[PDB]
Amino acid sequence: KQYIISEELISEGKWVKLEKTTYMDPTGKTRTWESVKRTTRKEQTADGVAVIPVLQRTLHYECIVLVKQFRPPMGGYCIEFPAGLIDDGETPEAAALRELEEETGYKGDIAECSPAVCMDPGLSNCTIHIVTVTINGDDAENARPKPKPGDGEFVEVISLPKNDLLQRLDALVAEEHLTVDARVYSYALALKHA
Amino acid sequence: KQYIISEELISEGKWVKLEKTTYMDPTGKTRTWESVKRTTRKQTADGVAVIPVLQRTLHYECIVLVKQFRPPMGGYCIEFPAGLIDDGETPEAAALRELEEETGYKGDIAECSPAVCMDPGLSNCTIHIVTVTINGDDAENARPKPKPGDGEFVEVISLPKNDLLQRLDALVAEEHLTVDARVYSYALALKHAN
Numbered sequence: 001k002q003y004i005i006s007e008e009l010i011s012e013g014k015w016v017k018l019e020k021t022t023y024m025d026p027t028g029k030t031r032t033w034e035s036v037k038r039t040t041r042k043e044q045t046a047d048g049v050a051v052i053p054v055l056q057r058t059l060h061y062e063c064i065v066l067v068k069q070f071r072p073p074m075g076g077y078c079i080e081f082p083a084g085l086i087d088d089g090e091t092p093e094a095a096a097l098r099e100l101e102e103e104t105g106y107k108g109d110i111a112e113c114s115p116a117v118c119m120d121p122g123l124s125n126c127t128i129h130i131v132t133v134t135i136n137g138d139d140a141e142n143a144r145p146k147p148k149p150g151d152g153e154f155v156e157v158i159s160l161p162k163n164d165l166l167q168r169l170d171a172l173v174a175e176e177h178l179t180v181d182a183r184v185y186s187y188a189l190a191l192k193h194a
Numbered sequence: 195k196q197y198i199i200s201e202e203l204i205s206e207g208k209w210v211k212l213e214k215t216t217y218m219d220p221t222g223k224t225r226t227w228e229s230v231k232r233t234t235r236k237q238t239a240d241g242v243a244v245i246p247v248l249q250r251t252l253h254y255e256c257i258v259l260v261k262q263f264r265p266p267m268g269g270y271c272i273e274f275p276a277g278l279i280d281d282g283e284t285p286e287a288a289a290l291r292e293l294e295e296e297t298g299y300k301g302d303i304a305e306c307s308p309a310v311c312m313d314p315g316l317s318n319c320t321i322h323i324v325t326v327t328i329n330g331d332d333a334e335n336a337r338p339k340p341k342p343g344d345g346e347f348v349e350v351i352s353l354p355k356n357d358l359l360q361r362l363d364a365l366v367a368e369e370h371l372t373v374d375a376r377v378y379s380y381a382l383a384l385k386h387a388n
């Protein structure tokens with residue numbers, strides 16, 4: 001039934017633009033919406049990737065590897081899956097493995113790759129692939145992994161046991177001013193609910 | 195160690211604004227970011243998203259989801275029921291109300307998250323994730339009455355919790371819908387548990 005009629009640029013930065021979207025409602029009436037988009041999306045099947053990195057080690061419980069960074073939009077520190085935007089011509093899988101190594105030091109193995117999923121669809125068109133990666137933490141490459149962050153990127157790695165992830169997250173939120181990412185929290189809730 | 199120095203208004207619409215954030219990086223260098231905010235926030239968060247666990251005896255437990263046209267996306271999305279928190283509403287109350295409006299179901303609060311960020315490299319948007327159980331055998335949830343507002347048009351999609359990830363993948367392959375990242379994350383963790 002519904003569809004876009006027009007998209008009008010309101011304002012365009014270096015990284016983000018705001019648009020006035022006109023669309024057709026299912027009753028047949030024209031309506032508008034204010035839409036956010038990134039300026040950096042070319043032919044990628046998505047803007048970015050987030051990596052679900054399952055750290056596996058003999059005689060250890062599996063960990064989920066997370067990153068903590070300052071997020072200017074939020075005015076504070078956030079705990080998130082490792083993530084970045086997909087470079088032009090780069091596959092979601094390569095992006096995921098590359099970002100994971102850059103942000104964490106770990107060299108993963110692809111497990112699965114989602115279709116493009118929407119970040120906040122009442123607001124933006126932004127999409128990612130969620131890439132599940134296993135990390136063989138018994139491999140020498142992953143022994144004392146060092147982040148290789150880019151210029152102006154500053155990241156702390158936090159590995160939490162999968163079998164207690166929601167409580168460990170809650171305990172971190174209790175001890176500091178920090179925000180957990182909604183995807184991380186969703187994943188931790190399902191681990192509990194399962 | 196990092197913090198916000200100033201925020202410059204770039205553009206303000208009715209619903210969304212775009213700002214240029216200046217912040218101190220940990221090296222003591224000053225840096226900028228483009229940040230999106232909603233103009234509607236006061237509340238602990240912009241919105242709520244409901245994880246609605248439909249429980250009917252002798253049936254699989256279902257997660258109740260919604261499908262709607264999303265003008266930013268230019269298409270249809272499958273999401274947790276959700277909406278913005280009304281001024282002076284509790285997150286729990288916003289959760290029950292949205293769940294009723296969007297699905298017709300009347301549910302019970304199980305747990306409620308802290309405020310969690312939607313896309314923190316882009317926006318300051320936050321939600322509470324509220325886990326709600328729905329006693330699908332009660333008479334009030336027999337023929338659920340969705341009471342949605344002016345211009346909302348929602349379809350309800352219940353999927354079994356124990357196969358959620360494979361059911362979503364299917365809807366994407368066949369219906370060309372975009373699944374929400376939080377929904378997808380939850381689904382992944384149901385599979386990844388143990």
Ligand SMILES: Cc1cccc(Nc2ncnc3c2cnn3C)c1
Nearest residue numbers: 033034122123209210343344345346
């Ligand atoms: C339920 C309802 C009725 C009529 C209009 C709206 N509009 C919006 N609701 C939420 N976010 C919005 C907008 C428009 N832009 N952005 C970003 C909502």
Ligand SMILES: Cc1cccc(Nc2ncnc3c2cnn3C)c1
Nearest residue numbers: 015016150151152153227228315316
């Ligand atoms: C790694 C790096 C170095 C230098 C600049 C950037 N900037 C950004 N990266 C991603 N999204 C962004 C921005 C600025 N605004 N928004 C929204 C990133």
Ligand SMILES: [Cl-]
Nearest residue numbers: 193247304325
């Ligand atoms: Cl539950």
Ligand SMILES: [Mg+2]
Nearest residue numbers: 082083084103
């Ligand atoms: Mg990143």
Ligand SMILES: [Mg+2]
Nearest residue numbers: 083084099102
């Ligand atoms: Mg990065």
Ligand SMILES: [Mg+2]
Nearest residue numbers: 275276277296
């Ligand atoms: Mg809604």
Ligand SMILES: [Mg+2]
Nearest residue numbers: 276277292295
């Ligand atoms: Mg609503």
